[PDB]
Amino acid sequence: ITITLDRSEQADYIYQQIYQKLKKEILSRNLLPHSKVPSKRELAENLKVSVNSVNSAYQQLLAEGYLYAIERKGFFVEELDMFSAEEHPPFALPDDLKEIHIDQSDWISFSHMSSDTDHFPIKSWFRCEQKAASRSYRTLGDMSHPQGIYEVRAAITRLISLTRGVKCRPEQMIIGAGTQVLMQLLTELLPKEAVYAMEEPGYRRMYQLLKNAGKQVKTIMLDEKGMSIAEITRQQPDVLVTTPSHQFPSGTIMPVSRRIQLLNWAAEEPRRYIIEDDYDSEFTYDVDSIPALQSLDRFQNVIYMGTFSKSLLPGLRISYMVLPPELLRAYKQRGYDLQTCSSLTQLTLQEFIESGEYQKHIKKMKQHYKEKRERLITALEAEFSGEVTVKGANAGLHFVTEFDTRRTEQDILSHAAGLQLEIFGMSRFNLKETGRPALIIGFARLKEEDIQEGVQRLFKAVYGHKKIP
């Protein structure tokens, strides 16, 4: 039949155009099943091309299965089933076209899920990456140890021992790439019918994870000392998920008395565990870093989970999990797990820590965040006056703000979105399902220049002030 070739410079190769055309004619039944195609030399002369082109085109059709060959004379069109001719679905629904990529500027964000990128020593970080690459060539092994590179885990071990008081062997550590991955892995090491208990309000993300994992999740109310031991002994769970260093999102710090109560509870009966979601303990502005709950544990019932998400690059995402011996044995009986963190990044982190650049970085950021947090609880107090109520300790990268307004939380979040302001509600942290109505205020990715404007935008959103045309 008719085959037109394109002699263009940047067109597909000759042999490519040939089998593409033949694929089309076979799929459209123009070339009947089991019908003989011309010989290589015959079709070549007919298209005035090299026989090696027709051969390469045929071999392509042979390998894919459009043609089959018989030992003597000719190739034949393989018999292909006709398409089901069902209802063809439309292409790209408009509501899924929500991705309207445009411009992140000038948006002002009060998000708690990021970090400042302006004060990050990117030059020192790249020096650590180059140094690690020239010493660990060729990237040590090929991939990585399932728990992560040992030297990297041993580095993090020394760090959290000096800064958190966490006592563990590198063998106990597992990274990483977010707590969401480590949490999933942990739920499979814990008993299948283990009852989990979370703080209300708390981390909605872990709640969704535990619910989608088919695990029963209890909700434990908070008091002035944090997670209520009274409700824990009442509902009687198996595994606790707490944030004692800085409660998410209430902001309260669990005192040593309440910690000992929990530790004693976990020692009362076997198969009881406490999960430590430590995510911003390295940032305290009135006091030093508080020794984590795991540091006081003597029964190895505490699972410590740390992260570098808020401390390093915003998108880096590297977490770690410290497993007690009994859970480590459960992990080693697997052997099919793969490391989710880039081995090249791990080596960089090891060098960033060992060179002392990390702790040096934390010190500078802690002062920067300290200064950014007020001015912030000063513009809010200047704008809202007594209409704003600020809850939460003087630490971390977020605090709660309650407002006196008739508008709902949704109406506030809608106006802010229309004023190019990224803020998040407080009702989303309600696990079991007020009105304050409260908002979570982050200042990690917040620029110091956009502080006064952000508060002014926030005010209009709270009281629904219309724009003057």
Q: Which of positions 294-333 make contact with a second copy (CB under 8 A)? A: 298-300, 309, 313-317, 324-326, 328-329, 332
Rounded-to-integer distance, Cα 404 and Cα 435, Å: 10
115 is a contact residue toward a second copy (CB under 8 A) = yes
CA atoms within 13 A on the CB side of 425: 19
157 is a contact residue toward a second copy (CB under 8 A) = no
CA atoms within 13 A on the CB side of 210: 24
DSSP state of 312: S
Name which position in 334, 360, 432, 465 contacts a second copy (CB under 8 A).
334
Rounded-to-integer distance, Cα 12 and Cα 3, Å: 14
Name which position in 17, 53, 114, 243 contacts a second copy (CB under 8 A).
114
Q: CB-based burial of residue 92 (10 Å sphere; 0-12 exposed, 13-18 middle, 19+ buried)?
A: exposed
Name which position in 263, 322, 379, 438 contacts a second copy (CB under 8 A).
263
CA atoms within 13 A on the CB side of 55: 4
In DSSP terms, 389 is beta-bridged to 402
48 is a contact residue toward a second copy (CB under 8 A) = no
Task: Kindly report the length of the chain.
Answer: 469
Please give the distance of CA 281 from its chain centroid, rounded to a whole number.
19
Q: Least distance to a second copy from the beta carbon of 444, Å?
A: 8
Name which position in 242, 311, 346, 427 contacts a second copy (CB under 8 A).
346
284: phi then psi, degrees, rounded to nearest 5: -125, 140
288 is a contact residue toward a second copy (CB under 8 A) = yes
Of 2-10, 132-140, 357-365, 371-379, the window that binds a second copy (rule: CB under 8 A) is: 132-140
Rounded-to-integer distance, Cα 344 and Cα 408, Å: 47
Name which position in 5, 113, 362, 390 contacts a second copy (CB under 8 A).
113
170 is a contact residue toward a second copy (CB under 8 A) = yes
216 is a contact residue toward a second copy (CB under 8 A) = no
Q: Least distance to Zn ion from the beta carbon of 240, Å?
A: 13
Residues 369-398 that bind a second copy (CB under 8 A): 393
221: phi then psi, degrees, rounded to nearest 5: -65, 155
Q: Least distance to a second copy from the beta carbon of 391, Å?
A: 16
90 is a contact residue toward Zn ion (CB under 5 A) = no
Residues 255-314 that bind Zn ion (CB under 5 A): 270
Residues 32-51 that bind Zn ion (CB under 5 A): none
Q: Least distance to Zn ion from the beta carbon of 299, Å?
A: 6
Name which position in 34, 70, 71, 142 contacts a second copy (CB under 8 A).
142
For residue 64, what are the contacts with CB-CB under 8 A and spacing of at least 6? 23
Q: Least distance to Zn ion from the beta carbon of 300, Å?
A: 7
150 is a contact residue toward a second copy (CB under 8 A) = yes
For residue 390, the surrounding DSSP H or E stretch is strand 388-391
Name which position in 3, 260, 382, 417 contacts a second copy (CB under 8 A).
260
DSSP state of 420: T
335 is a contact residue toward Zn ion (CB under 5 A) = no
Q: Least distance to Zn ion from the beta carbon of 294, Å?
A: 14
**Distances 302 to 75, 262, 370 between C-alpha atoms, Å:** 69, 10, 30
443: phi then psi, degrees, rounded to nearest 5: -145, 30
User: Per-residue contact track with a second copy, 62 to 101, x per CB under 8 A?
Assistant: -xxxx-----------xxxxxxx-xxxxx-xx--xxxx-x
196-200: strand order across its sheet: 173-174, 319-322, 302-307, 273-277, 239-242, 196-200, 217-223, 226-227
For residue 235, what are the contacts with CB-CB under 8 A and spacing of at least 6? 197, 218, 220
235 contact choice in a second copy, Zn ion, none (CB below 5 to 8 Å, kind-dependent): none
- Closer to Zn ion by CB, 270 or 356: give it: 270
Name which position in 243, 247, 345, 427 contacts a second copy (CB under 8 A).
345
74 contact choice in a second copy, Zn ion, none (CB below 5 to 8 Å, kind-dependent): none
- Closer to Zn ion by CB, 214 or 270: give it: 270
DSSP state of 392: S
130 is a contact residue toward a second copy (CB under 8 A) = yes
212 is a contact residue toward a second copy (CB under 8 A) = yes
Count residues binding a second copy (CB under 8 A): 116
* Runs of H (alpha helix) within 164-240: 179-189, 204-212, 229-235
What is the dihedral angle through the alpha carbons of 30, 35, 40, 41, rounded to the nearest 10 degrees?
-90
Q: Least distance to Zn ion from the beta carbon of 167, Å?
A: 17
Q: Please give the residue ranges that form the binding site for Zn ion (CB under 5 A).
A: 270
